[PDB]
């Protein structure tokens, strides 16, 4: 049983969980009740999976807008660093993934429609512009599952 | 048995471990073999402590030089985020601490000499300018231990 997790580490990102012979699942990244990721709630979400130790997690490499201030670059690195630290500390095998990696394999901005096509049972969850993070997480997971025959 | 850990999260930072009725200890933050923190080695160091769950960890709030580029602010946030994520994921109780907090309680740049005075048995480890991170980690731990009678 080889699970694959895909993570969009942005503050409006998400986590996708793909288990073999099971429908896909996706989870909005929890935020504090202050736009800020909630490390405690991320840890608890991950722990609730009871995933096999060493389960592979693919994390999109955060790259910031060219037009972002100094606290904006600090914030993107903080969130990416928090996810890496959480995942490595939780026993997962962590593979950073440039956004170009999955965007290239899936014709890619159409990520929401592309995710709906690959994961029809989740299309209701990708209808709105806010669902971009859910879409990226699913595509990253799909990418990390690889091309494989039965 | 109430342990206190102090962490300077900078790339040349360090971790200080204070146990009751034991001499203090300090550890350079491990780096990759590429200036880059090594998340796997940080996790393993923390796990090797076998600390009580919920042990309190005080982490200096990373603030970057005003004169630092966009990748420089991204790097300081990444390292601070990685430490927070590692510590929360590892079950510790994490308290961020402004540098002003301990600098104010210990007359504070003289942190290396101040650390040597408070922790004489470690003064050999604070002799060089490279030992700044060790000094800050110890001061943060001393600060987090609090003022308390026997």
> Could you tell me the strand content of chain A as a percent range?
15-25%
The gross shape of chain A turns out to be globular
Number of domains of chain A: 1
| Most extensive interface, chain pair and sizes | A-B, 26 and 26 residues
Oligomerization status of the protein chains: homodimer
Helix content, binned percent of chain A: 25-40%
- Tally the helices of chain A: 5
**Counted beta strands of chain A:** 5
Largest sheet of chain A: 5 strands, mixed
PDB class: plant protein
Keywords: chloroplast, resolvase, plant protein
Assembly: dimeric
Entry title: Crystal structure of chloroplast resolvase
Task: Give a structural overview.
Chains A, B: Keywords: Metal-binding. Chains A, B: It comes from Nicotiana tabacum (Common tobacco). Chains A, B: GO terms for molecular function: crossover junction DNA endonuclease activity; metal ion binding. Chains A, B: This is Holliday junction resolvase MOC1, chloroplastic-like. Two copies of one chain form a homodimer. By secondary structure, chain A is an alpha/beta fold. In chain A, helix 1 packs parallel to helix 2 and helix 4 crosses helix 5. The longest helix of chain A has 20 residues, at 70-89. Chain A has helices at residues 39-48, 70-89, 99-105, 111-118, 132-145, and strands at 4-8, 14-18, 25-28, 56-60, 93-97. The first copy, chain A, has one domain. Chain A contains five helices and five strands. Chain A starts with a strand and ends in a 5-residue tail after the last helix. A five-stranded mixed beta sheet of chain A has the order 3-2-1-4-5. In chain A, strand 1 and strand 2 (14-18) form a beta hairpin. The interface between A and B is medium-sized, with 26 and 26 residues.
């Amino acid at each position: 049983a080889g699970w694959v997790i895909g993570v969009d580490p942005d503050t409006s990102g998400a986590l996708a969980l793909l288990k073999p012979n099971q429908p896909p699942q996706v989870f909005d990244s929890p935020h504090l009740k202050v736009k800020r990721l909630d490390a405690k709630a991320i840890v608890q979400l991950l722990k609730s999976f009871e995933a096999p130790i060493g389960t592979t997690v693919y994390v999109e490499q955060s790259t910031p807008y060219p037009q972002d201030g100094k606290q904006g670059w600090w914030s993107g690195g903080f969130g990416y660093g928090m996810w890496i630290g959480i995942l490595v500390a939780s026993g997962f095998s962590v593979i950073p993934v440039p956004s170009s990696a999955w965007k290239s394999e899936f014709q890619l901005d159409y990520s929401r429609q592309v995710a709906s096509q690959l994961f029809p049972s989740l299309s209701s969850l990708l209808k709105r512009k806010k669902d971009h993070g859910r879409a990226e997480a699913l595509l990253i997971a799909a990418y990390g599952k690889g091309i494989k025959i039965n």
